[PDB]
Amino acid sequence: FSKFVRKNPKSDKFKVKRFHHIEFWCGDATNVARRFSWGLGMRFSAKSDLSTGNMVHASYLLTSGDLRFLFTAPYSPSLSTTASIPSFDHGSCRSFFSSHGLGVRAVAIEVEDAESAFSISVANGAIPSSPPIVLNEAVTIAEVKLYGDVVLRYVSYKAFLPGFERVEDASSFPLDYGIRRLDHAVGNVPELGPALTYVAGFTGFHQFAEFSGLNSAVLASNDEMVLLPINEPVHGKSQIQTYLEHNEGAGLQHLALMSEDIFRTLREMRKRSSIGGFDFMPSPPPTYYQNLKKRVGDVLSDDQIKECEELGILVDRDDQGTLLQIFTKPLGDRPTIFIEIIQRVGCMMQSGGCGGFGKGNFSELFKSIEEY
Amino acid sequence: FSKFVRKNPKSDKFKVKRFHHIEFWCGDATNVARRFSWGLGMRFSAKSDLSTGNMVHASYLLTSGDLRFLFTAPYSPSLTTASIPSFDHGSCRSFFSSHGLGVRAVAIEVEDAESAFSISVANGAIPSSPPIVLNEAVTIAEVKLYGDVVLRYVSYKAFLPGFERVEDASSFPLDYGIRRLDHAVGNVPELGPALTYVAGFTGFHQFAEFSGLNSAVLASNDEMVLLPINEPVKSQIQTYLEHNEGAGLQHLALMSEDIFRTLREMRKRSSIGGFDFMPSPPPTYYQNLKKRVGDVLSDDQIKECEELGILVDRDDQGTLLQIFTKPLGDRPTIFIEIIQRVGCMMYQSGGCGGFGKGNFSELFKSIEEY
Ligand SMILES: CCN1c2ccc(C(=O)c3cnn(C)c3O)cc2N(CC)S1(=O)=O
Ligand SMILES: CCN1c2ccc(C(=O)c3cnn(C)c3O)cc2N(CC)S1(=O)=O
Ligand SMILES: [Fe+3]
Ligand SMILES: [Fe+3]
């Protein structure tokens, strides 16, 4: 008697595969990469610093399944090229970090051909940031402006990056809390309209249909595995407006990290919150989890709803699947970028965006807190 | 029969008590403090950020015993409410862009910071921040030490105003045995003008000395505040100056009540967010220990040094156990020394056992064989 109809034109102007990596720009990459590695359970797998010959910048790669986190900091220009990332600029990293703080600089996706994806993007309105550059006849990398100071990096292959030496573990069994891949990367913009027209104008990404102080929209690729949601603030206190003021303009709001077992990951992450890891936002009242069995009782057992209450995980669902989700506190000094830990249940063939993004938890949390 | 004669003029131009804190300037203080907290075992105990009203800078205080590490990072100027009145946005950005993560202030406890500041400037010291009384309770002033590092004078009348305490709220709060700062060392291009300048406005006397650098130690009257300086003679000091872009603090020696407990805990966390250590001496170094420190350390404590890579040195009066970490940040500049002094129990004489100058030959000797 109820039905939600999804439509997918599959209008991608170029062939995109998966998310490749996320590049944070830092002031000191070593302390941030080691903070994230311990708090998130990501292995130190590659690097491109002075120990490898790179006298321009220091970059460290953390991996966990298919998720790649790159942490890049600039060296002093008096060390002069030996840079392994050709898009890197000292005056651009300093300006980015001095104005936005710790945050995401590049959102990298894998494509069939970064050189073609760059020409089609620029030809369809995108502002170019870094032209296509072929590294060692193996990898091609191009960058276009996404929003604010974030660039959409195109990555393509011929068969991590050239100039990176792989880092091998000294621990008996390396770090791993269950995070396997990036699900979606969300940015905040002043006006949602021009952002959607711009991004979808050069990517061909269609809008993913949805089942507080913001207006949200999700741009998705043909297979809906690369998800780029965007939020604008609703005025008349909004976190999006608080984001833009402390970030000095638009920027990436949060990254959702998919876990093969969100209880395993939250058990590890919450263990380390006060000993170097990441803190989490306040948990819903106990009335929230008592209301779970009546709306997700056919998906989660009685012992699994108990497990969400102990860890602070929110549950949401739509017409196709179910979503387990929780949010960390801001990763750095500024109340800007944070991290979401999710696990999607259902839509097995696993469809992209299964269970939605948790928009129903706005009222579900508001309704549950109203038991006071 | 040998004897080492030490002289102490006690020429302090003002009353100096003890080391108060060390302040790191960062780009993101949150990730630097949390990384140091896990690898060193220091407790998050105070803060001054926007959650407390400070819209100028974010400052976090890690403590372990009497050791105080402050981590400060600047906010966006588009946001005074600053708790550190000497803080400057245009100075912190320039500092971190030229030296990277490093020590900005070496703070010492004094009887009167305003008197210590006036006597310093009148004796050649370059002023950095004038005496400023905070909430009619604390006075802080800053003079140039070397490079962009400043010597900070702190005095009381009975951490700092504007700082709210944060309760650990853990059953095993972080503690690896570190208790206080022993000494803080800086590298300079020319040691001569540095000693003349620093000792010229402090009255600190040279601490008598029982590879690639020339060093001297400036100590206070009680020799509990030790400020050594290094110049280059291939030299790590020269490589430091190139990457640090001038003079600056080289390392901080953290005094531990049990260096074995601390080294276990720190080596446990090297690959999971903590700190890495410099290569350990060959096994011939530790086979030669019993004929060097056999009357101080037991055989099983020498075993404990070999398992942890700890270096042991000795002088006329005391014995010193020490070890060194790798650089704390991107640049091969500032590192950390972990020490434990044995002997000179009087309630312990500062600089007991020296600073490990004898380990340069002892380490080179141990590599000769094997
Ligand atoms: C429970 C209420 N909250 C909620 C719900 C969903 C999403 C979300 O992930 C989302 C919403 N739209 N799109 C596209 C998305 O990815 C974020 C957040 N919060 C912010 C941390 S929250 O805790 O306030
Ligand atoms: C080869 C033994 N090494 C050693 C010995 C003593 C000190 C030291 O703490 C010291 C010496 N003089 N002053 C004033 C200090 O504070 C540092 C270091 N190394 C660190 C690069 S080391 O491994 O080369
Ligand atoms: Fe999300
Ligand atoms: Fe030392």
Q: Does B337 show up as a binding residue in the annotation?
A: yes
Give the angle subtended at the CA of A360 by the CAs of A357 and A365, to the nearest 5°.
115
B48 vs chain A: nearest CA distance in angstroms?
A: 11
Q: CA–CA separation, B48 vs B84, rounded Å?
A: 9
Please, are residues B231 and B251 in contact by the beta-carbon 8 Å criterion? no
DSSP sequence for A283-342: PPPHHHHHTTHHHHTTTS-HHHHHHHHHHT-EEEE-SSEEEEEEEBPPSSSSS--EEEEE
Please, are residues A32 and B26 in contact by the beta-carbon 8 Å criterion? no
Q: CA–CA separation, A351 vs B243, rounded Å?
A: 50
Q: Specify the CATH number of the domain A1-176.
A: 3.10.180.10
Helices A302-311 and A262-271 cross at an angle (nearest 10°) of 30
- CB-based contacts of A1: which residues, under 8 Å, 6+ apart? none
Q: Locate the chain A residue with the closest alpha carbon to B172.
A: A275
The answer to whether the Cβ–Cβ distance between A31 and B328 falls below 8 Å is: yes
* Total Cβ atoms within 10 A of residue B217: 22
The answer to whether the Cβ–Cβ distance between A28 and B332 falls below 8 Å is: no
* Total Cβ atoms within 10 A of residue B238: 16
Instruction: Give residue A266's identity as a one-letter amino acid code.
Output: L
Please, are residues A60 and A69 in contact by the beta-carbon 8 Å criterion? no
Tell me phi and psi for residue A182, to 5 degrees.
-85, 130
Written as six digits, the tokens of A146 are 């996404």
Written as six digits, the tokens of B316 are 């006329």
A201 vs chain B: nearest CA distance in angstroms?
A: 33
> Of A227, A180, A209, A158, nearest to A318 (Cα)?
A209
Tell me phi and psi for residue B359, to 5 degrees.
-80, -15
Q: Which helix (H) or strand (E) holds A142?
A: strand A139-147
Measured in angstroms, how far is the CA atom of residue B333 from the centroid of ligand 4?
14
Q: CA–CA separation, B327 vs A297, rounded Å?
A: 53
By the 10 Å C-beta count (0-12 exposed, 13-18 middle, 19+ buried), A301 is classed as exposed
How far is C-alpha B278 from the geometric centre of its chain's CA atoms? 18
User: A96-107 burial, b if ≥16 CB within 10 A, otherwise e?
Assistant: bbbbbbbbbbbb
> Of B109, B70, B67, B72, nearest to B87 (Cα)?
B72
Written as six digits, the tokens of B357 are 């100058």
* Chain A environment of B273 (Cβ under 8 Å): 34-35, 37-39, 276
Q: Specify the CATH number of the domain B176-370.
A: 3.10.180.10
> Of A233, A21, A221, A13, nearest to A107 (Cα)?
A21
Q: Locate the chain A residue with the closest alpha carbon to B31.
A: A32
Tell me phi and psi for residue A171, to 5 degrees.
-70, 150
Q: CA–CA separation, A20 vs B24, rounded Å?
A: 35
Please, are residues B312 and B293 in contact by the beta-carbon 8 Å criterion? yes
- The full set of domain ranges for chain B reads 1-175, 176-370
Measured in angstroms, how far is the CA atom of residue A23 from the centroid of ligand 4?
37
Please, are residues B10 and B205 in contact by the beta-carbon 8 Å criterion? yes
Residue nearest to atom 6 of ligand 2 (CA): B356
Q: CA–CA separation, A328 vs A308, rounded Å?
A: 15
- CB-based contacts of A5: which residues, under 8 Å, 6+ apart? none
DSSP sequence for B142-211: EEEEETTEEEEEEE-----TT-EE-----SS---SSEEEEEEEEEE-S-HHHHHHHHHHHH-PEEEP---
* Chain A environment of B243 (Cβ under 8 Å): 76, 79
Please, are residues B353 and B315 in contact by the beta-carbon 8 Å criterion? yes
> Of B305, B342, B311, B307, nearest to B324 (Cα)?
B311
Q: CA–CA separation, A33 vs A48, rounded Å?
A: 13
Please, are residues A124 and A13 in contact by the beta-carbon 8 Å criterion? yes
Written as six digits, the tokens of B51 are 């959650």
In words, the CATH class of domain A177-372 is alpha beta
Please, are residues A128 and A118 in contact by the beta-carbon 8 Å criterion? yes
3-state class of B281 per DSSP? coil
By the 10 Å C-beta count (0-12 exposed, 13-18 middle, 19+ buried), B185 is classed as buried
- Residue in the block written with tokens 């009357």: B295
> Of A37, A167, A281, A310, nearest to B35 (Cα)?
A37
Domains A1-176 and A177-372 equal at CATH topology level:
yes
What resolution, expressed in A, was reported for this entry? Answer: 2.7
> Of B201, B219, B194, nearest to B209 (Cα)?
B219
Residue nearest to atom 24 of ligand 1 (CA): A362
User: B353-365 burial, b if ≥16 CB within 10 A, otherwise e?
Assistant: bbbbebbeebbee
Q: CA–CA separation, A32 vs B28, rounded Å?
A: 9
Please, are residues B137 and B98 in contact by the beta-carbon 8 Å criterion? no
The answer to whether the Cβ–Cβ distance between A101 and B34 falls below 8 Å is: no
Residues flanking ligand 2, CB < 6 Å: B 183, 185, 215, 217, 228, 236, 278, 324, 337, 355-357, 359-360, 363
Q: CA–CA separation, A44 vs A40, rounded Å?
A: 12
Instruction: Give residue B352's identity as a one-letter amino acid code.
Output: C
Residues flanking ligand 1, CB < 6 Å: A 184, 186, 216, 218, 229, 281, 314, 327, 340, 357-359, 361-362, 365
Written as six digits, the tokens of A314 are 């929110």
Best of B357, B364, B365, B368 to mutate for ligand 2, by most ligand atoms within 8 A of CB? B357
3-state class of B62 per DSSP? strand
Q: What is the distance between the terminal CA atoms of chain B, rounded to a whole angstrom?
A: 32
Residue nearest to atom 16 of ligand 1 (CA): A357
> Of B280, B353, B275, nearest to B38 (Cα)?
B275
Written as six digits, the tokens of A356 are 């939605």
Written as six digits, the tokens of B70 are 């402050």
CATH superfamily, domain B1-175, is 2,3-Dihydroxybiphenyl 1,2-Dioxygenase, domain 1 (3.10.180.10)
* Chain B environment of A333 (Cβ under 8 Å): 28-30, 49, 58, 73, 75
Q: CA–CA separation, A92 vs B178, rounded Å?
A: 40
3-state class of A247 per DSSP? helix
- Cross-sheet strand order for the sheet of A16-25: A128-135, A139-147, A150-157, A103-111, A16-25, A67-74, A57-64, A43-48, A165-166
- The ligand placed nearest to the CA atom of residue A359 is 1
B49 vs chain A: nearest CA distance in angstroms?
A: 8
Which CA distances in Å does A158 have to A111, A143, A170? 11, 18, 32
